[model samples]
Target: DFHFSAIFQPTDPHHHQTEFAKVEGSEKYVEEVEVFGRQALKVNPEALTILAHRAFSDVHHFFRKDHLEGWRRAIEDPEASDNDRYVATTLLKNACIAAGRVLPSCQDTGTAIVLGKRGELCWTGGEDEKYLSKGIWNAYRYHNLRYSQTAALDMFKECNTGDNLPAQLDLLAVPGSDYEFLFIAKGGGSANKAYLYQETKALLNPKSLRAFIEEKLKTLGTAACPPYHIALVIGGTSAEMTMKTVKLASCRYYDSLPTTGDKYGRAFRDPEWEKIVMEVAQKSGIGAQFGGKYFAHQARVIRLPRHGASCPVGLAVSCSADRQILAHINKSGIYIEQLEQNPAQYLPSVKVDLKRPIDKVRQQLSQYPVGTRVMLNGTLIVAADIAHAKIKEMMDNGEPLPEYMKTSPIYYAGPAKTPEGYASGSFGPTTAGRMDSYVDLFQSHGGSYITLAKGNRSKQVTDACKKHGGFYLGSIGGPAAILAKDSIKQVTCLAFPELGMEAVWKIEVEDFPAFIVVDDKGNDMYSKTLA
Candidate 1:
């Protein structure tokens, strides 16, 4: 019964009477009571607030066992490329720092998402939604998290909601008398990756569908951050239904689902097919961020009974952060899923410094071909979406590009609020894909000579790099906390101070990590498909 949440939604729909998995080492906390002469559980609205705050805090400051294990595997693999090992090491270190609760795992703290199920006998004075929202509000308000939610005043303008309120809360009624919830702080990079494909029955055959999926995988690129836990859903009554299934599968919420279908015609996971698909992903060579074998940490393929002529293929991913946890209130008490708190135990004994002298690294950058691993240290100009727009606006008015932009490498990113006495908050790279369009314009003007951020770039960026003697470096996407704690030594707003975190800033970094993806010699590492 609880497996239902594992497959279609974030929470399980099973009877709370059964013992669900509890977080390790934490004492169980719950309240027992009776209401209206029926045996019902009594929960204070404040409990929701506490849980909400804790869930958000946990994801930002810790990682689940599976995600940590994946990074450990990458670091231990001798056959892995230097780029792979470097990123894996940084990620593991980030997990350790995140455990300290001072910095979030990623700069994009993400939107609050909650899925709740109430049993008929569970009573919360009918104010459950309000209570959950309050909990979410407290988490974002008190914590140094980003205010990502924006209120659309009209078609043209929007403003930050200030309190990250109005969460995506999906509440459903369950058969048994117990309440359970699934909490997720989904980052923009991963949450925006949900994709749906409407197709006909003709493409349902394994060979045809497999080929089609491979082509689509190429389009997934490295934007959403990898290695990903990818989910694919084939066949659904509606497009939305298929996409929902993809979300569940991506989270591994469907891991407990039955492997085969019955005459009743329900959804099921195919382990054999999953292995084959994961193999295909590995063969694609989009490993982790650059080249290797970890493009996908794992893959889940679910098939649902569909209409006679319609087949909707849905794709989604649980990106590197992989943040999601389960909570339940039953006859016993309240319990949330346990995440690994001490991740440093997974770090290997040996270590290597990937950073090099700034001038020396740049001088050799031209000599090193694409795919050559490199570490960067020294200064960088921090900018992203709004900052780019402001720069373009200045140039349009006949203003020359900023001297800082011309002399220092530009890092595409916007940081979360910095905690007191800290050099930076969760400072990580944003997607480079969106900034691709500005590459030619910026490079042509003698600015943005060398750029750094996450994901693969398009031909335009490559061409611009070639023409302008520029370079684009790929920074591992998931280690914002480590970068803040160990790499970045200072940060100061240089322009557009009103942009808040989006303001263009000057940052001094020590041993900042990155790989040369696009080189001045017109060579690109990700240009060729690994397969």
Candidate 2:
């Protein structure tokens, strides 16, 4: 006798937890007819474009209810540190700005990811990825979003793909006539945080597993933008499966799975372990891009069947720019998850001026110890991943460090396209660690004495700051739209204009929020927690 069991069996199969809105007059996109004595749905290929475009565009401007609730919790929780509440409130305000639909929430608009489950009887004439990609292209091309995809022409040379095309499309065939989907716009910062580990049964014990998590969580730091939605998948048939499961778990896609495991080796959600993860995150003190109790808004732990000799673990995070949407195509029309339109209902800093001489600005920052909040008002020289490397190449060839890098605090950032009549687009700090190697070199040349960016850095950065009498300011990673709309007064490309968003930018800012992360005395804010 042959017995059959599906790996995933969610109790609430039709996604009862989500509220959806049907596309207006979308019944035209599909026709229900009889075939082979059964009913099937014939979907117009154009509907895929309509759904993809709306899903991608809408997800950027809005957020899911759970995500909004988490930020609200951070503000309301008395246990949260002052920095935690500040970051939460700022993000909520940013959400309000993004909701205006003119500016996206973050500068790195992200790589489009589509997960589609098309029923065998649902016909769309195939070529699903093509239509989906066109929709994604239209969104980035027409909106204020940034073009983040890069195409490699050679080992060391690359160029922006222009319209953020070639989406990560995964389409599957299911049994019914209804097609379901999940769309994610995963930014480089947040996507980089997804990691996979191969282990054995030795790591299965409670104590070992707990210790393992503690060690791994610290590695995440604040780079990907917290408060994070952390997901850990304990086992899988293969490493790729584990990673895929973890990614979906981060988006809360598997929330409805059974809580308890079964003899048939079905996948299940482990709520108890999720609680342990939350406890670890709270106690870790690597909170919300700065320091405090809200490192993660929530945690998800899923256990799946694995081979006897192999156990694959995967970890991933949904950062503050938590963007994902659920949709389905059925007899009625196309339906999409309804994200929070009124982020203001979920509602929920210091003054630093940098317009003075560089040395004077350094002296002002030196007075504050690590973790002290301050407001930055003045000009900021902006450069990140590519711009840093470009400058380094010039130096290696004997060209001196540019004066722009030497003047004012260097902000590690990139901007989305400026909206009509706006001073700047969604401008936010990128991960500081990406440009860590350039710190000492730049400082030695009498430049980069002051740097501003998001997340923790390596020990070398602290050493360089101490040796060079430099300071690194920690800017809130999310809340880009609000910063652009309120703080930035002007934007100019200083050099490398061909680099597009990665160009060297000089911007004037007022009331810019930041914290003293690294100081002249070799002090780092993340020492206690990340160490």
Whole-model lDDT values for every prediction: 0.78, 0.93
lDDT (Cα, 0-100) at 317 in candidate 2? 98
296 in model 2: Cα distance from truth in Å? 1.2
Could you give candidate 1's per-residue lDDT for residues 276-379 as a string of tens digits?
77887878877778887777778899888888878888888888778887787666555777778899998981111314443344566777777766666677
Span of 10 residues, lowest total lDDT, candidate 1: 349-358
- What is the Å distance of residue 482 in model 1 from its true position? 1.4
* TM-score versus the correct structure, for each prediction: 0.89, 0.98
**Top-lDDT candidate index:** 2
Lowest-lDDT window of 10 residues in candidate 2?
Answer: 348-357
Superposed Cα deviation of residue 390, candidate 2 (Å):
1.0
Alpha-carbon runs more than 4 Å astray in model 1: 1-38, 349-364, 394-400
